[PDB]
Design a protein around this ligand. Sequence first.
Ligand code: 732
Ligand code: CA
Ligand code: CA
Ligand code: CA
Ligand code: CA
Ligand code: CA
Ligand code: CA
Ligand code: ZN
Ligand code: ZN
Ligand code: ZN
Ligand code: ZN
Lengths: 163, 165
Amino acid sequence: YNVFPRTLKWSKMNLTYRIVNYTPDMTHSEVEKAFKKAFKVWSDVTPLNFTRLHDGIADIMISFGIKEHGDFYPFDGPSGLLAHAFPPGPNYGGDAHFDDDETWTSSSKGYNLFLVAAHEFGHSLGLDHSKDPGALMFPIYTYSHFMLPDDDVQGIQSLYGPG
Amino acid sequence: YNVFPRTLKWSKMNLTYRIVNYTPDMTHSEVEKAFKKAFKVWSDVTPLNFTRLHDGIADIMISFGIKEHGDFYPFDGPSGLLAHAFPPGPNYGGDAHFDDDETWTSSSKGYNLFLVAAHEFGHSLGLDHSKDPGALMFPIYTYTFMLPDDDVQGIQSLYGPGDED
Ligand SMILES: CNC(=O)[C@@H](NC(=O)c1ccc(-c2ccc(Cl)cc2)o1)C1CCCCC1
Ligand SMILES: [Ca+2]
Ligand SMILES: [Ca+2]
Ligand SMILES: [Ca+2]
Ligand SMILES: [Ca+2]
Ligand SMILES: [Ca+2]
Ligand SMILES: [Ca+2]
Ligand SMILES: [Zn+2]
Ligand SMILES: [Zn+2]
Ligand SMILES: [Zn+2]
Ligand SMILES: [Zn+2]
């Protein structure tokens, strides 16, 4: 027999990502900075490294879309679903999609892109939702400096080990 | 904290299903019985329970359709692809689609809905195809029921045996 195997973790430490397109709500540089900082959340406590590609295929393809956007997991307009990401694997595996019917910001006016991305990239690296209300990986959004909670540190190091 | 399960499986033992629509080929009662019997194939050898919903959102949505029917796996008219089902997961995960350009039966003619459904539900629960030509999860249709051991071992590797007796 065969079951559907789940790439619990990336079998490689050096991963690439690409920002495929951009939300209207923030400057290109603000978006790039938020995503860079969201990966650094994870790379800071593991041996994982992330390098940005500007074209072609990367392990982690990042994009903004609305409603049905090419994976049959449609978004739902403002509020509700904010973003989703696929667990590690080929093709859509690892990819992160953000609902461009939300208002994204570098601040508190709408949804903080950095924080949601940080959460999403946790899914891209193999983490599930946490039960701990204080965990970044908790399924509920809440809003200058960010410290990865111990619950998330333990979860990700259980997959990849410490840096 | 939680890491993604090693294998694609449902994290709860109580699952729901919904028959969204019906083939022209069989009565509602015939279709209902075939699907009920197909779920029992798997509930009998695990701790899984399946409850039917008449509407709303179920874990396993069952529908008949033809050609393009709302996913990346369009059917192809009579013959060829008969049906497919998505592995455990959010939204369409678990869902099972039957090509309504086929002839569905409760006999040995055409395609026996019960047998194709039991196979599809194996996919809905996290089984891929087997290389064992006697397995229910073997990828080619043949008409015959007792769940083969290759499939029992497969499904129990995921969910355990439930009550062994
Ligand atoms: C006659 N058509 C088929 O057998 C095609 N089968 C299916 O689409 C399909 C879905 C369910 C099954 C199936 C497989 C084995 C058993 Cl014991 C019962 C049902 O098969 C298959 C044929 C090989 C190429 C892929 C599609
Ligand atoms: Ca990818
Ligand atoms: Ca939304
Ligand atoms: Ca927007
Ligand atoms: Ca067909
Ligand atoms: Ca479903
Ligand atoms: Ca038909
Ligand atoms: Zn998406
Ligand atoms: Zn999440
Ligand atoms: Zn389909
Ligand atoms: Zn199959």
